[PDB]
Amino acid sequence: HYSPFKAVWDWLILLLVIYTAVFTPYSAAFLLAVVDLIVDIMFIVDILINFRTTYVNANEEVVSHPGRIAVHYFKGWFLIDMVAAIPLIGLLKTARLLRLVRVARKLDRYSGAAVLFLLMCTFALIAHWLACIWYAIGNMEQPIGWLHNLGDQIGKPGGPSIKDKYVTALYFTFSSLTSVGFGNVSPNTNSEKIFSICVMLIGSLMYASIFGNVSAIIQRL
Amino acid sequence: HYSPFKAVWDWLILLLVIYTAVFTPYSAAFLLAVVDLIVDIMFIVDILINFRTTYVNANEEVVSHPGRIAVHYFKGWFLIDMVAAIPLIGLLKTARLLRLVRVARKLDRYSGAAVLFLLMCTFALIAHWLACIWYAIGNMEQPIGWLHNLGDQIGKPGGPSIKDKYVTALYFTFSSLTSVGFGNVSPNTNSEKIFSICVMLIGSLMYASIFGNVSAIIQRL
Amino acid sequence: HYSPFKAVWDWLILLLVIYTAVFTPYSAAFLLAVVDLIVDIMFIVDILINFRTTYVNANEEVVSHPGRIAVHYFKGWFLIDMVAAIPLIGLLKTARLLRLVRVARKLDRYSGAAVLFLLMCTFALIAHWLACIWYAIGNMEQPIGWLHNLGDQIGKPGGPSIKDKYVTALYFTFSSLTSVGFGNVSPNTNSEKIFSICVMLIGSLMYASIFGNVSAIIQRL
Amino acid sequence: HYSPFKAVWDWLILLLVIYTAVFTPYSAAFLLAVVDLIVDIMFIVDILINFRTTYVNANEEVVSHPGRIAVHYFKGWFLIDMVAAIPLIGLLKTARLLRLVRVARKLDRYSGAAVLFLLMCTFALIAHWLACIWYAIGNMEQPIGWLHNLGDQIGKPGGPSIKDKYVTALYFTFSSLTSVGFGNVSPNTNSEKIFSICVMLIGSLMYASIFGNVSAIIQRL
Numbered sequence: 023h024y025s026p027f028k029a030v031w032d033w034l035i036l037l038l039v040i041y042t043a044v045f046t047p048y049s050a051a052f053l054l055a056v057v058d059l060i061v062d063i064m065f066i067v068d069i070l071i072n073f074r075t076t077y078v079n080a081n082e083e084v085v086s087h088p089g090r091i092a093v094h095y096f097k098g099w100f101l102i103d104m105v106a107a108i109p110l111i112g113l114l115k116t117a118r119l120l121r122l123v124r125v126a127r128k129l130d131r132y133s134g135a136a137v138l139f140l141l142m143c144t145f146a147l148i149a150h151w152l153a154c155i156w157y158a159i160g161n162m163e164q165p166i167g168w169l170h171n172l173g174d175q176i177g178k179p180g181g182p183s184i185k186d187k188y189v190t191a192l193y194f195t196f197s198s199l200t201s202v203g204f205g206n207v208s209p210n211t212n213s214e215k216i217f218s219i220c221v222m223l224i225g226s227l228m229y230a231s232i233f234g235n236v237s238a239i240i241q242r243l
Numbered sequence: 244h245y246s247p248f249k250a251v252w253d254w255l256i257l258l259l260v261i262y263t264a265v266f267t268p269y270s271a272a273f274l275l276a277v278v279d280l281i282v283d284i285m286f287i288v289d290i291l292i293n294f295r296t297t298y299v300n301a302n303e304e305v306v307s308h309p310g311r312i313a314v315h316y317f318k319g320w321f322l323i324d325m326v327a328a329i330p331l332i333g334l335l336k337t338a339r340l341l342r343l344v345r346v347a348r349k350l351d352r353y354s355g356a357a358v359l360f361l362l363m364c365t366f367a368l369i370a371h372w373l374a375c376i377w378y379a380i381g382n383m384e385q386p387i388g389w390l391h392n393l394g395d396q397i398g399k400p401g402g403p404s405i406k407d408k409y410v411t412a413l414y415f416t417f418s419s420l421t422s423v424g425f426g427n428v429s430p431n432t433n434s435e436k437i438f439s440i441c442v443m444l445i446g447s448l449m450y451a452s453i454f455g456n457v458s459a460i461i462q463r464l
Numbered sequence: 465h466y467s468p469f470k471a472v473w474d475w476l477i478l479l480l481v482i483y484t485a486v487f488t489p490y491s492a493a494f495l496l497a498v499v500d501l502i503v504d505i506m507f508i509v510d511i512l513i514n515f516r517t518t519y520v521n522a523n524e525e526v527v528s529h530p531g532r533i534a535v536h537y538f539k540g541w542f543l544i545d546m547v548a549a550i551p552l553i554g555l556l557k558t559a560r561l562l563r564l565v566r567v568a569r570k571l572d573r574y575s576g577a578a579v580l581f582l583l584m585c586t587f588a589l590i591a592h593w594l595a596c597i598w599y600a601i602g603n604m605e606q607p608i609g610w611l612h613n614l615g616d617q618i619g620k621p622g623g624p625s626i627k628d629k630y631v632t633a634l635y636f637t638f639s640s641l642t643s644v645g646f647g648n649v650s651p652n653t654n655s656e657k658i659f660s661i662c663v664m665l666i667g668s669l670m671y672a673s674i675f676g677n678v679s680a681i682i683q684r685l
Numbered sequence: 686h687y688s689p690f691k692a693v694w695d696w697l698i699l700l701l702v703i704y705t706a707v708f709t710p711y712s713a714a715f716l717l718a719v720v721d722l723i724v725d726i727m728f729i730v731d732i733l734i735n736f737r738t739t740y741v742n743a744n745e746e747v748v749s750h751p752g753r754i755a756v757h758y759f760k761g762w763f764l765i766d767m768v769a770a771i772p773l774i775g776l777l778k779t780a781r782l783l784r785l786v787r788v789a790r791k792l793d794r795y796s797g798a799a800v801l802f803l804l805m806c807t808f809a810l811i812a813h814w815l816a817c818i819w820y821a822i823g824n825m826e827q828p829i830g831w832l833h834n835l836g837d838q839i840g841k842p843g844g845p846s847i848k849d850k851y852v853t854a855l856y857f858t859f860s861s862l863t864s865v866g867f868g869n870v871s872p873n874t875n876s877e878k879i880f881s882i883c884v885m886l887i888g889s890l891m892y893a894s895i896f897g898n899v900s901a902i903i904q905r906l
């Protein structure tokens with residue numbers, strides 16, 4: 023768990039965890055090109071590595087005869103990892119998001135020089151998820167909305183391009199998160215306004231917290 | 244005052260104090276369904292408990308013969324509690340708001356794990372009260388306003404639904420409090436603009452103070 | 465300089481200094497009702513008190529024979545105080561603003577319980593002065609502007625009421641200072657936009673500084 | 686390197702470095718009056734001074750026979766300084782921006798009384814560069830945009846004045862940087878919106894960092 027190979031491959035599993043975290047909601051809510059397997063099987067490769075690797079107990083160091091820790095990993099958590107590593111409504115691919123638990127246990131690797139990028143990227147991930155939810159709402163809530171008005175802000179009532187309908191949603195989520203509100207996008211229906219209240223509260227929370235933290239990092243530097 | 248029964252029932256009296264604080268202004272300014280008695284009488288139950296409970300003096304511990312502290316509670320404060328616990332213009336139900344004093348004396352119970360939720364909920368309560376005031380103003384100031392323009396933002400000039408006319412007011416109060424100002428709602432008349440100056444000042448005060456406090460809590464964690 | 469009479473009268477001279485500071489620019493830029501003399505002569509009363517009062521030197525305590533300190537006050541600063549206390553273009557009444565120097569020397573009186581109100585009131589004074597400047601600009605810059613558009617936001621192209629044309633300017637200055645920008649007021653001409661850049665910079669400076677200070681006060685409490 | 690002449694002339698080279706940093710992008714992206722030479726040759730004057738001046742080694746003090754440090758300056762960095770000091774597409778004048786490196790090595794001169802102005806001026810420089818980029822985008826992205834709409838906000842579809850088309854861009858960059866968003870300017874096309882996301886992130890970063898720093902300076906004072 024501390025070899026150069028283990029270290030670099032763990033950095034790589036974080037990289038591909040970021041990859042899946044940013045590419046599963048996108049194609050899960052926007053698209054209803056063969057790079058899937060190289061990571062869907064890399065995760066079970068990681069599972070087997072977790073089987074064969076070395077580990078430290080509550081006070082026991084790394085031990086030989088590597089069979090004692092497999093049932094221990096299964097007793098700690100393996101079912102969630104397994105259902106993560108499993109390929110009409112095939113929406114269950116969203117369970118792949120459980121790969122986030124992967125970066126919950128190994129934070130001793132990354133916990134100043136990297137935390138800044140990590141905070142900016144988690145802000146970006148939060149923005150991505152909220153833009154995904156906003157697009158889901160603006161597409162589901164049909165019998166006037168915001169997509170109707172985007173259809174006139176850009177002269178494409180048919181249907182605007184998907185790059186446009188995603189970049190605008192990301193723009194709006196950054197607007198509401200960073201408390202600017204340019205006004206070209208404006209929640210107008212009732213579910214929109216309730217989501218806007220929710221996102222304003224979540225902004226006042228997270229935009230304040232992570233940026234107090236980044237100011238603390240700057241001061242520590 | 245320190246039994247498990249006393250503790251849980253005090254948490255419950257805080258819960259129902261939040262209940263009344265959030266449900267009296269609402270139906271007091273928006274509505275001019277039998278859950279009233281179960282708390283209006285629970286408050287006088289609490290009064291009798293305050294009579295029969297045990298208490299500590301300036302330096303004296305809890306004493307037997309529980310009759311010495313009743314007149315002492317009456318000398319400290321009982322008239323406000325009594326007029327709180329009392330059922331043309333029956334607007335006097337707003338005096339029920341005095342139940343807030345109930346959570347003024349027992350803050351040693353709640354003063355980190357709960358203070359975060361308490362701060363978010365007091366921000367929500369402030370938002371609720373200011374949205375109530377805004378609705379009162381937008382309904383009273385008649386001979387052009389903001390409700391007139393909401394009648395066109397949502398295609399309902401008659402009268403919009405009460406859920407709509409409340410969710411928009413809460414949306415606007417969160418907007419002005421968190422300094423975003425999406426622009427779909429816009430104070431346009433003179434009393435509106437004076438209220439907007441007042442709320443901008445109260446925002447610059449409270450939005451700054453409570454969030455400095457929440458950043459301090461996060462740092463302490 | 466330390467009697468109860470001196471103390472209360474100094475608090476009163478601060479009160480009337482606030483009075484003149486908030487009522488000279490207003491009627492100096494908006495109005496081109498006999499309460500003027502009671503303070504214009506109270507200032508020279510204060511001058512005579514400064515003559516007759518007691519004072520402490522660099523190391524010398526209060527001395528008898530009160531004639532040694534008059535020429536000393538005249539050597540320190542008396543000409544500015546005199547030209548302050550003096551009644552076609554009589555715009556020179558703006559020199560009365562020099563009464564602010566009066567509260568520059570006596571800050572040891574007020575320097576926590578009062579500093580909060582003092583900071584809120586100096587924010588209000590800054591808002592007042594900037595709204596005065598904004599009204600001066602919107603009235604002078606004539607050959608499309610913002611007053612033209614206010615004439616349609618409120619159905620009064622003639623001329624809107626002075627209370628309206630002042631409350632809107634104060635609203636806009638609070639907007640730009642507290643970084644909300646509701647959008648009902650919008651700088652559109654070139655001098656307007658240059659003033660807006662200036663006020664945005666002055667906001668980013670002062671709104672940040674005074675509110676860091678008020679957070680520090682809250683933390684000290 | 687520590688004479689009064691050296692000190693004042695170094696302050697002057699910082700002044701003219703600010704001059705070139707603020708006047709090269711402007712005329713490099715807006716203008717496609719003989720004050721150029723007096724500084725373009727002053728920079729190579731500075732080069733010769735760096736040749737002839739005195740310097741301190743890792744531990745060696747200033748030494749006589751001033752020929753040992755010339756090749757050392759050439760080994761440290763001279764090619765970038767030389768290509769800085771060198772006069773169809775003559776866009777290579779943007780390489781003059783490398784004069785910023787000049788104020789990278791001599792920060793021990795300026796590192797409280799001056800840092801405030803320096804921070805305000807670097808915020809102004811960032812605003813200038815971003816307004817330059819915004820103008821470049823709004824002029825290049827042709828086959829609806831923001832300049833089209835400015836052509837109606839100010840009644841000049843032809844072409845608006847260059848002072849107007851620059852003061853508006855600086856206004857918008859201050860808006861997006863200080864998180865106000867008055868709404869008179871509104872990104873509407875796709876490249877505009879992507880730039881807006883980028884600038885909102887860069888705002889949330891720098892507007893927070895430099896103003897935490899200015900609050901720290903105020904507290905230190």
Ligand SMILES: [K+]
Pocket residue numbers: 201202203422423424643644645864865866
């Ligand atoms: K804002």
Ligand SMILES: [K+]
Pocket residue numbers: 202203204423424425644645646865866867
């Ligand atoms: K805004």
